[PDB]
Design a protein around this ligand. Structure first.
Ligand SMILES: Cc1cc([C@@H](C)Nc2ccccc2C(=O)O)c2nc(N3CCOCC3)cc(=O)n2c1
Length: 837
């Protein structure tokens, strides 16, 4: 139908890529997947409670922490219910369900409890203590304000219903580049590799022929591998060395479990400055400039003491610890003892010779047991381990996705970005994970909204992965409901408008520190033009979907004084039932790859949760950040917060003569009462402690004081992770923060002891989750950090988390790092001034 011809055009402008376009495919995988995702989509769309879906309640089954129980020592929670002008508080029990509170209001002289200023609803059979918004207010000191109004109409959420034994051979015909002049002429060869998860089964090279705009070889390359022994997921990697220049991959076994046959003219990817993009089945879509390759395909006793100890020692080691042939052969001979240990699964599966039909068959016999694994307690770090680059077998990856299914939505939101990025390591487009991300995305609207923006960030930036993600985004968009589709349409239109403004203002400026009347007057009218008839009355905040934003506070909107020129935007809340007059502030910044900030902030949310398990609150501010396109995106504005450099440049001014007192003076200056300075010193102890631990672990500690911020309420925090991703420091700890602690160079004050206590308590709390942190880090680098990728680049986390060593040797190592910051004082800080200024 014609209505389906415009619907698809809506999906295309939403996705930012055309899913129907067959100009850059050599097979029907993407279309077959588009057709294959209709089943799991409808298996959720036509399976979800329309009432709870429309209301999207945010709940958690996790225990309320020791610190959050300290806020309610009276066993009573106060909730303020509002209708119009009337507002009366209720003495509610922590275990009281929304319905129990609904009747406790009717009795105290059809409707649903909606949050004030937020598109959030406190509904469903859950106690009020087990709500994320309630736990937020209890952590910040806010009162739980709610509106009495009718439930959201599920009719708005309607979905538009749709619908042998011979050795492997490869003939390398030749290579053709239209234009090569950039470097001095040398020789060239092709390296055809048969791989199954970063592991080469065999390698065959061509003879070196001279580098020309067309190099013909016509050589048949016979491999050591037989056609029967080729595993599903086997990826023929074609490489070019002058020393690597061009890579390309072809899935020897296809999506229908068929060996690839025929003539293929593959457009290859170049190298600029191991890597997730290096594994792509997708060809280069820019056929005019790219190098192509022409190829042709026509084809029961138990263990002794010391061995059990040897095996147990192997399972013990961190994910990064490599395995010798001895270790691998050990794991394999004692398969069944290794199967009895779930922590051995990532190591046992790396001991499989996948280029052996017989060994794979034995591996599949082991997977049939699964009893130990299926009954084992879910380990996210072990589940993620089996979903990485080192695992290409579908049935191996399925057991990880099987173990994932148990997660509550809250934990799905916790690991979403890392799971979204893990799709990059999948051999085929349609996968158990891709189907899992889709199911969960349609079951809840919060996962849905964030799944949309995560897929979109990569679609409008990655040529290597735009096509596959696009197929998964369409699948979601084709079942999210008319309302969400309407919402994303607004959001995108607004982001597109505001990115236009950002670049225009970036162009209308020269690198130097200026802020000339011309740029300020232009910015004023630029926004004024879009305010009147371009941007709608209300758009949803992508980083915080609870919040709806209205009109711009033009008089509050600015542009940075320095080289990057990002816009500082401010918006009024679209909700007239809001608790305050607090604006919605956004930063739009071009130059820095905000995908790197996203990953660091998502790990920061993880660390916070890990700390919660050992009842620690490190006052971290993982502010919202979404990458929208190439070297551009949004940043959430943390209210009434200033850079550390600005607090130093106020009393002093553009000098390295950093006076330690200025910081505490600012804290007492911005405090209305003495109690408000006491709460500010408390917030500073945790916030400084958390960010010291968090940064050192992630090896992003040595930072310039301009890239560290602080609030009027004492909460200190790190910023701009994109630009960072000799004399050195492990992290940031200078005498200015130390003065607030109460130390005059050499002192062990009551607040610096508190910091020293917390820091080791937090570092060890993260050591109880070593294998998880190591995986998330290893994955973060492979999927988000191009320059930060090699064996030695990933191996940083081991030394930082002090792998192998005891709690005593760990306690020592971290406090020694605090001392490195104390020995240096301001030496690396002044060095920043020589490079920056
Ligand atoms: C490079 C740069 C710069 C800034 C800010 C501090 N600087 C500005 C950004 C935009 C407009 C004006 C300024 C200003 O320098 O006053 C900045 N602010 C961030 N925010 C984190 C959340 O709290 C609000 C701040 C985050 C970030 O990555 N930033 C990066």
């Amino acid at each position: 139908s014609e209505e389906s011809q415009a619907f698809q055009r809506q999906l295309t402008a939403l996705i930012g890529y055309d899913v129907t376009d067959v100009s850059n495919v050599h097979d029907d995988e993407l279309e077959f997947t588009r057709r294959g995702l209709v089943t799991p989509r409808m298996a959720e769309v036509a399976s979800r409670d329309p009432k709870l879906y429309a209301m999207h309640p945010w709940v958690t089954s996790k225990p309320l922490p020791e610190y959050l129980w300290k806020k309610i020592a009276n066993n009573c929670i106060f909730i303020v219910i509002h209708r119009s002008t009337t507002s009366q508080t209720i003495k509610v029990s922590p275990d009281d369900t929304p319905g129990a509170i609904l009747q406790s209001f009717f009795t105290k002289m059809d409707f649903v409890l909606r949050v004030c200023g937020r598109d959030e609803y406190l509904v469903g059979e859950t106690p009020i203590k087990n709500f994320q918004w309630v736990r937020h207010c209890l952590k910040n000191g806010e009162e739980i304000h709610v509106v009495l109004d009718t439930p959201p109409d599920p009719a708005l959420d309607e979905v538009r219903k749709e619908e042998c034994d011979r050795k492997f051979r490869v003939k390398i015909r030749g290579i053709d580049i239209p234009v090569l002049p950039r470097n001095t002429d040398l020789t060239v060869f092709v390296e055809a590799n048969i791989q199954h998860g970063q592991q080469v089964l065999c390698q065959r090279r061509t003879s070196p022929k001279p580098f020309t705009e067309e190099v013909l070889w016509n050589v048949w390359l016979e491999f050591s591998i037989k056609i029967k022994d080729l595993p599903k997921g086997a990826l023929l990697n074609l490489q070019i060395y002058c020393q690597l220049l061009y890579y390309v991959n072809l899935l020897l076994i296809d999506h229908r479990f068929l060996l690839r046959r025929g003539e293929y003219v593959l457009h290859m990817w170049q190298i600029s400055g191991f890597n997730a993009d290096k594994l792509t089945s997708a060809t280069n879509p820019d056929k005019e400039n790219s190098m192509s390759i022409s190829i042709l395909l026509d084809n029961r006793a138990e263990m002794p003491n010391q061995l059990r100890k040897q095996l147990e020692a192997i399972i013990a080691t961190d994910p990064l610890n490599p395995l010798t042939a001895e270790d691998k052969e050990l794991l394999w001979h004692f398969r069944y003892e290794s199967l009895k240990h779930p922590k051995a699964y990532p190591k046992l599966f790396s001991s499989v010779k996948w280029g052996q039909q017989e060994i794979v068959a034995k591996t599949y016999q082991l997977l049939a047991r699964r009893e130990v694994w299926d009954q084992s307690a879910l380990d996210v770090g072990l589940t993620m381990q089996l979903l990485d680059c080192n695992f290409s077998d579908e049935n191996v990856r399925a057991i990880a996705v099987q173990k994932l299914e148990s997660l509550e939505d809250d934990d799905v939101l916790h690991y979403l970005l890392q799971l979204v990025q893990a799709v990059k390591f999948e051999p085929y487009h349609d996968s158990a994970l891709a189907r899992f991300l889709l199911k969960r995305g349609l079951r809840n609207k919060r996962i849905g909204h964030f799944l949309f923006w995560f897929l979109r960030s990569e679609i409008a930036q990655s040529r290597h992965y735009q096509q596959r993600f696009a197929v998964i985004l369409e699948a979601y968009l084709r079942g999210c409901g008319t309302a969400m589709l309407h919402d994303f349409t607004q959001q995108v239109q607004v982001i597109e408008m505001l990115q236009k403004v950002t670049l225009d203002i970036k162009s209308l400026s020269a690198e130097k520190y200026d802020v000339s009347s011309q740029v300020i007057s232009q910015l004023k009218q630029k926004l004024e033009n879009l305010q009147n008839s371009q941007l709608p009355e209300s758009f949803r905040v992508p980083y915080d979907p609870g919040l709806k934003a209205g009109a711009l506070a033009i008089e509050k909107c600015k542009v940075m004084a320095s080289k990057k020129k990002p816009l500082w935007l401010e918006f009024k809340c679209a909700d007239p039932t809001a608790l305050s007059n607090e604006t919605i502030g956004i930063i739009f910044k071009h130059g820095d790859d905000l995908r790197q900030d996203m990953l660091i902030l998502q790990i920061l949310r993880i660390m916070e949760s890990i700390w919660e398990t050992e009842s620690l609150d490190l006052c971290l501010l993982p502010y919202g950040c979404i990458s929208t396109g190439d070297k551009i995106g949004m940043i959430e504005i943390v209210k009434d917060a200033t850079t550390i450099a600005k607090i130093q440049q106020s009393t002093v001014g553009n000098t390295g003569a950093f006076k330690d007192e200025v910081l505490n003076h600012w804290l007492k200056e911005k405090s209305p009462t003495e109690e408000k300075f006491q709460a500010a010193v408390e917030r500073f102890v945790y916030s400084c402690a958390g960010y010291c631990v968090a940064t050192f672990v992630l090896g992003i500690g040595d930072r310039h004081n301009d890239n560290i911020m602080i609030t009027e309420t004492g909460n200190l925090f790190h910023i701009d992770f994109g630009h960072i991703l000799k004399e050195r420091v492990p992290f940031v700890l200078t005498p200015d923060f130390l003065f607030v602690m109460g130390t005059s160079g050499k002192k062990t004050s009551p607040h610096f002891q508190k910091f020293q206590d917390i820091c080791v308590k937090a570092y060890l709390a993260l050591r109880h989750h070593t294998n998880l942190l190591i995986i998330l880090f290893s994955m973060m680098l492979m999927t988000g950090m191009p320059q930060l990728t090699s064996k030695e680049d990933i191996e940083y986390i081991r030394d930082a988390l002090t792998v192998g060593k005891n709690e005593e040797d760990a306690k020592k190592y971290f406090l020694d790092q605090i001392e490195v910051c104390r020995d240096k004082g301001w030496t690396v800080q002044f060095n920043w001034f020589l490079h920056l200024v």
